[PDB]
Amino acid sequence: GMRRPTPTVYVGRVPIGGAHPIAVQSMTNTPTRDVEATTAQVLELHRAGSEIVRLTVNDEEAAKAVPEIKRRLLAEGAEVPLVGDFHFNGHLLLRKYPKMAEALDKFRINPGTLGRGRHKDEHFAEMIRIAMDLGKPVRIGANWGSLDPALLTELMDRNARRPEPKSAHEVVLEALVESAVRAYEAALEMGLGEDKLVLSAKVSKARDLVWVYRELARRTQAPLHLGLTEAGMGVKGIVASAAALAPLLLEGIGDTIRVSLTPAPGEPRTKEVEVAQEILQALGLRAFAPEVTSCPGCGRTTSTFFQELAEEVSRRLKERLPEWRARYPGVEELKVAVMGCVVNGPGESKHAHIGISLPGAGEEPKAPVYADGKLLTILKGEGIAEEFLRLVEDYVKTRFAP
Amino acid sequence: GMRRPTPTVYVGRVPIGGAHPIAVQSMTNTPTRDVEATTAQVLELHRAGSEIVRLTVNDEEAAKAVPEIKRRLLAEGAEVPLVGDFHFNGHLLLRKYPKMAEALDKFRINPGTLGRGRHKDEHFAEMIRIAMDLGKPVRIGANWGSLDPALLTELMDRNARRPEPKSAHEVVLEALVESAVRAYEAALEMGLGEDKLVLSAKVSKARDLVWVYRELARRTQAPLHLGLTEAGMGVKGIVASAAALAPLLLEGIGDTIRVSLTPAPGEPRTKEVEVAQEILQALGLRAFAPEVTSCPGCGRTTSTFFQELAEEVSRRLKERLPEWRARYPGVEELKVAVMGCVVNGPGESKHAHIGISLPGAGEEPKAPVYADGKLLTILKGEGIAEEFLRLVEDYVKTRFAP
Ligand code: F3S
Ligand code: F3S
């Protein structure tokens, strides 16, 4: 359990907070001014499982496009909450384009991209005023890539007065937290409701992220948008995102997540959504699709045969999921095992809803299948793969019948 | 910090324990009887960064091959510690083939694959006796795929007597821990040294793994071999492994790790080593290679150009690493940033050793480069990529000079 309690903030129809499932979100990478490209990518992300979708609203042409994007989404019955990402000129764009402001379901403010000196407080105030006027929620999202330089100096001076000064790195982290907390407190004091404020304070190193979010969670009551910013490419990005989020999520900290992956060229923007879902599912926080538990396989089993069967099982579950979702409520929780030999095969298969254990070296050429913790059958000969997937189909029909 | 103190256990020349870096290991998936295939894969894994390599010693033909595998490894000056994985007949194989027993650098025992009833205690005793005779360390590795059924019943009965009985799942976890701890205690009582015992107790769900290892860490003083067993295939396997290990590793629990990925057909067995390394590096526990921090890119930057540059930078760092390792001590710690626009580009680049920030929408077409927290130059025109990699080469030569 352990979930941190928070007020509920609605982003469109999606509730965020301690009483609600942790929401997966993402961000487009098309130019927002391109209505056709951006609308298609919003739909793509939403269908992959992005419950909320953010898009940059960076200039006038972007802002003018947002109402039309929203129109086209509604025209296909797609109710996907949109978050506007504002930097530098957020106050100008919201002021000048009230239809954009109304079309968005949430505004993102970064307290480090408000402007210079005195201009900061006024810009912040205008954006919060507009959100208040329209009943919109706001994310106050700090990021250490854009840390308020005047706040850092204030905190550097406080640090230098300590009997034992902390390192420069630690003060940067202090400043990042203080940036978010101060603006949070300022928005509340201005009259913005607790039901309209989400916070983030992102850094790009996992152990720093854990420190930051523990402070945010202690010092505020807001729902928290959690992510490891600038996680990077490929396996590194995936691992770093999972490693940063897991300790916090297991502690009950975090109400919505975004995975900040750099796509490989040609790689679809949906990869980040898949990774976000896998993180939540790995930790038992949500269930999105059936999952396969499979052993690595070693010298006790024939590698090609074992690897191909596991891959075939995973492919079939993926093909059947759209249909299963529609017919079989709760099927998201399905656990299937594919195992290499007698060492752990039966035992792991018995912990799954349904599982197969192949014969390894020195074993009779037969493959026991277990369901609900006991022997269902034993398969042999050709077509082991097809016969098993039929049994999984049969199992699903019965277990997850309405 | 926070590292759990433990005695040091040497596996060949590799020390495991609280005073030592967390060791990456892996396991072969070739038939051990195939000397040529297994020797080549041991070398492959070792060169990828597997500091210790495990291989199954499942039958007589496997056991006879082990001395020859070791001979061939030494013949190329490869000092890679070998762990023998024993199940069911470990006592027979070690007794009958003393040259295999001597060729291994560690024996793995699973207290759930010893045999039936009375036969368990005697088989365990003989294997520990042989390890003691030869001065070998042992891993007592429990796995919930092979949980001792008699111990589970004992613990189920204890549970049923409680005022508030726990769930069956929780008792399985209790039994898994008790399996490892009891055998640990039995080996110590038999005379096996604290410098010769490593423990594991693996499960396939992340939140259960965290519970288990917190108990093991509290109830024992041994170094701990940490892994999420049967993690599975592709992105799911990677994410689940990272998510399970990170909370424990951040708490200071764990002295060596193995990532239990199911390879895709054709996919090299080294992928698990890469993932293990990325987990440790993501958490700042070890450094294996230069890493790139890159933003996801959004509508503020041109997607193809940004993604290609980031990919090109990552490819070049990978190509240069063998040479850099040899010439530039400490280069493993290098942090390079590749960023999409002015929002977080400069700030993140300034936290890296060296970083480039591309021009996004509405910006002048120039790309500032930062090193050691300040502006180094500004690039423009064609060949931005090549000019940046030259600057990174120059930076590395200076920063990491002997
Ligand atoms: S890694 Fe090896 S021990 Fe058997 S169940 Fe898996 S084949
Ligand atoms: S995601 Fe967008 S805000 Fe700029 S630095 Fe990265 S391009």
mmCIF file of C-alpha atoms and ligand atoms in Angstrom, chain A residues 295-298 300-301 339-341 343-345, ligand 1:
data_model
loop_
_atom_site.group_PDB
_atom_site.id
_atom_site.type_symbol
_atom_site.label_atom_id
_atom_site.label_comp_id
_atom_site.label_asym_id
_atom_site.label_seq_id
_atom_site.Cartn_x
_atom_site.Cartn_y
_atom_site.Cartn_z
ATOM 1 C CA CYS A 295 13.373 -17.718 -17.296
ATOM 2 C CA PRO A 296 16.623 -16.654 -18.993
ATOM 3 C CA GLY A 297 17.298 -20.196 -20.125
ATOM 4 C CA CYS A 298 20.701 -21.786 -19.546
ATOM 5 C CA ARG A 300 19.886 -27.068 -19.147
ATOM 6 C CA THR A 301 17.483 -26.247 -22.046
ATOM 7 C CA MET A 339 9.979 -21.868 -18.497
ATOM 8 C CA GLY A 340 13.039 -23.797 -19.649
ATOM 9 C CA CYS A 341 13.374 -26.873 -17.407
ATOM 10 C CA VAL A 343 14.512 -26.660 -11.914
ATOM 11 C CA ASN A 344 12.194 -23.663 -11.594
ATOM 12 C CA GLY A 345 9.666 -24.441 -14.336
HETATM 13 S S1 F3S C 1 17.657 -20.572 -16.660
HETATM 14 FE FE1 F3S C 1 18.103 -22.786 -16.643
HETATM 15 S S2 F3S C 1 17.587 -23.800 -14.733
HETATM 16 FE FE2 F3S C 1 15.876 -24.265 -16.009
HETATM 17 S S3 F3S C 1 14.053 -23.056 -15.662
HETATM 18 FE FE3 F3S C 1 15.584 -21.653 -16.681
HETATM 19 S S4 F3S C 1 16.400 -23.424 -17.936
#
